Design a protein around this motif. Structure first.
Motif, PDB file in Angstrom:
ATOM      1  N   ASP A 163      73.133  52.049  47.452  1.00 17.57           N
ATOM      2  CA  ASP A 163      74.355  51.237  47.334  1.00 17.57           C
ATOM      3  C   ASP A 163      74.453  50.176  48.423  1.00 17.57           C
ATOM      4  O   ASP A 163      75.464  49.474  48.469  1.00 17.57           O
ATOM      5  N   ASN A 164      73.408  50.029  49.242  1.00 19.93           N
ATOM      6  CA  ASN A 164      73.366  48.905  50.195  1.00 19.93           C
ATOM      7  C   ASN A 164      73.185  47.556  49.426  1.00 19.93           C
ATOM      8  O   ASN A 164      72.589  47.462  48.338  1.00 19.93           O
ATOM      9  N   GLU A 165      73.657  46.465  49.994  1.00 17.87           N
ATOM     10  CA  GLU A 165      73.583  45.225  49.226  1.00 17.87           C
ATOM     11  C   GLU A 165      72.172  44.832  48.661  1.00 17.87           C
ATOM     12  O   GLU A 165      72.092  44.413  47.492  1.00 17.87           O
ATOM     13  N   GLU A 166      71.094  44.952  49.441  1.00 14.74           N
ATOM     14  CA  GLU A 166      69.761  44.540  48.996  1.00 14.74           C
ATOM     15  C   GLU A 166      69.341  45.343  47.776  1.00 14.74           C
ATOM     16  O   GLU A 166      68.799  44.840  46.772  1.00 14.74           O
ATOM     17  N   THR A 167      69.583  46.644  47.873  1.00 10.04           N
ATOM     18  CA  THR A 167      69.114  47.547  46.815  1.00 10.04           C
ATOM     19  C   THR A 167      69.981  47.395  45.588  1.00 10.04           C
ATOM     20  O   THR A 167      69.443  47.437  44.468  1.00 10.04           O
ATOM     21  N   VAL A 168      71.290  47.215  45.765  1.00  8.62           N
ATOM     22  CA  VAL A 168      72.154  46.865  44.632  1.00  8.62           C
ATOM     23  C   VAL A 168      71.660  45.598  43.922  1.00  8.62           C
ATOM     24  O   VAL A 168      71.551  45.595  42.701  1.00  8.62           O
ATOM     25  N   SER A 169      71.351  44.518  44.667  1.00 11.10           N
ATOM     26  CA  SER A 169      70.821  43.319  43.979  1.00 11.10           C
ATOM     27  C   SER A 169      69.572  43.633  43.130  1.00 11.10           C
ATOM     28  O   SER A 169      69.520  43.262  41.955  1.00 11.10           O
ATOM     29  N   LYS A 170      68.609  44.400  43.673  1.00 14.35           N
ATOM     30  CA  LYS A 170      67.429  44.735  42.909  1.00 14.35           C
ATOM     31  C   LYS A 170      67.823  45.557  41.687  1.00 14.35           C
ATOM     32  O   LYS A 170      67.375  45.257  40.588  1.00 14.35           O
ATOM     33  N   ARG A 171      68.696  46.536  41.855  1.00 10.90           N
ATOM     34  CA  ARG A 171      69.115  47.348  40.698  1.00 10.90           C
ATOM     35  C   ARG A 171      69.766  46.514  39.638  1.00 10.90           C
ATOM     36  O   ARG A 171      69.515  46.714  38.441  1.00 10.90           O
ATOM     37  N   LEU A 172      70.688  45.616  40.018  1.00 11.56           N
ATOM     38  CA  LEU A 172      71.239  44.700  38.983  1.00 11.56           C
ATOM     39  C   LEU A 172      70.186  43.872  38.253  1.00 11.56           C
ATOM     40  O   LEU A 172      70.258  43.753  37.005  1.00 11.56           O
ATOM     41  N   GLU A 173      69.204  43.303  38.966  1.00  8.25           N
ATOM     42  CA  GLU A 173      68.217  42.412  38.370  1.00  8.25           C
ATOM     43  C   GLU A 173      67.382  43.243  37.414  1.00  8.25           C
ATOM     44  O   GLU A 173      67.181  42.894  36.253  1.00  8.25           O
ATOM     45  N   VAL A 174      66.948  44.386  37.894  1.00  6.46           N
ATOM     46  CA  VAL A 174      66.077  45.219  37.106  1.00  6.46           C
ATOM     47  C   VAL A 174      66.748  45.708  35.810  1.00  6.46           C
ATOM     48  O   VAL A 174      66.168  45.697  34.687  1.00  6.46           O
ATOM     49  N   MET A 176      69.659  44.478  34.340  1.00  5.42           N
ATOM     50  CA  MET A 176      70.003  43.378  33.424  1.00  5.42           C
ATOM     51  C   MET A 176      68.840  43.013  32.538  1.00  5.42           C
ATOM     52  O   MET A 176      69.000  42.905  31.320  1.00  5.42           O
ATOM     53  N   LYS A 177      67.637  42.918  33.119  1.00  4.74           N
ATOM     54  CA  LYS A 177      66.495  42.497  32.361  1.00  4.74           C
ATOM     55  C   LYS A 177      66.061  43.456  31.253  1.00  4.74           C
ATOM     56  O   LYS A 177      65.371  43.044  30.347  1.00  4.74           O
ATOM     57  N   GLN A 178      66.407  44.731  31.397  1.00  4.92           N
ATOM     58  CA  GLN A 178      66.098  45.767  30.405  1.00  4.92           C
ATOM     59  C   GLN A 178      67.223  45.923  29.416  1.00  4.92           C
ATOM     60  O   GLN A 178      67.033  46.502  28.345  1.00  4.92           O
TER      61      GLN A 178
END
Ligand code: AP5
Ligand code: CA
Ligand code: CA
Ligand code: CA
Ligand code: MG
Ligand code: ZN
Length: 217
Positions: A163-174, A176-178
């Motif tokens: 839930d840290n900002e960097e990892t949240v950004s990766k989780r959203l990108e990943v 969304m794309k699926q």
């Protein structure tokens, strides 16, 4: 009542699922919750998953589908179940179709809790989880009675490591794309039921109940 709950990271899948399982009496099967229990147990499943989870990437399809196939074979899924966060990819959904055919437990509906990407960082960064029972709170949107402590059991609240900002950004990108191919899959089957997830928690649940009341015995 054979259900899937889907939605982007932070959309409120756990929040809604907890309510569903208490009111309709079906097991809550969250792949994230399964992977984290495995990691806490330091099992080999947990070690394999952890590499991906800590980076915010998806765990590979093959082991994810395996854990779900075995979970859905338990006696507690015989009158219904609530999958939460699985399927997350179209290949997972194809695999689940075949699993559920063999098992005689075909999906009724896929509930998609729809929430704009832009609102999700704030949901995740403000999220606080109970160390004892895993129920989730939010500092602003759904706070505990006593700051830093679970209402139910007095457990210390924590932040999930991803839930840290960097990892949240990766989780959203990943994720969304699926998501679109998965929505396409279920829209073509007719199973997809979309709910507006940007409402009060009880208003999202009222809309969920409007669907589930038509499916109960
Ligand atoms: N099928 C699969 N395939 C491959 N890999 C997989 C996989 N499944 C899992 N994984 C791996 O496991 C990792 C973790 O998966 P997982 O744990 O499933 O994470 P996720 O999908 O990122 O979702 P979260 O648990 O973070 O959020 P949620 O939708 O349940 O929202 P919540 O109710 O807590 O609510 C969020 C916050 O908002 C608050 N809130 C809830 N509702 C509302 C509302 N209506 N208004 C305002 N705030 C609200 C809550 O209080 C809380 O603070 C993945 O990143 C991946 O690596
Ligand atoms: Ca069995
Ligand atoms: Ca209302
Ligand atoms: Ca409304
Ligand atoms: Mg969850
Ligand atoms: Zn608790």
């Amino acid at each position: 009542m054979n259900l899937v709950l889907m939605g982007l990271p932070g959309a409120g899948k756990g929040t809604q699922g907890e309510k569903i399982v208490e009111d309709y009496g079906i097991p809550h099967i969250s792949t994230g919750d399964m992977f984290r229990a495995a990691m806490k147990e330091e099992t080999p499943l947990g070690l394999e998953a952890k590499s991906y989870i800590d980076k915010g990437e998806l765990v590979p399809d093959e082991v994810t589908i395996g854990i779900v196939k075995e979970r859905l074979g338990k006696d507690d899924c015989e009158r219904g179940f609530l999958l939460d966060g699985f399927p997350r990819t179209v290949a997972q959904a194809e695999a689940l179709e075949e699993i559920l055919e063999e098992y005689g437990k075909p999906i009724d509906y896929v509930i998609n809790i729809e929430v704009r990407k832009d609102v999700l960082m704030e949901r995740l960064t403000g999220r606080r989880i109970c160390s004892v029972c895993g129920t989730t709170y939010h500092l602003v949107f759904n706070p505990p009675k006593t700051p830093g402590i679970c209402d139910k059991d007095g457990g210390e609240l924590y932040q999930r490591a991803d839930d840290n900002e960097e990892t949240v950004s990766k989780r959203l990108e990943v994720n969304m794309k699926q998501m679109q191919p998965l929505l396409d899959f279920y829209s073509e089957k007719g199973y997809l039921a979309n709910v507006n997830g940007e409402q009060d928690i009880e208003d999202v649940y009222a809309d969920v109940k409007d669907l589930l009341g038509g499916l109960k015995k």
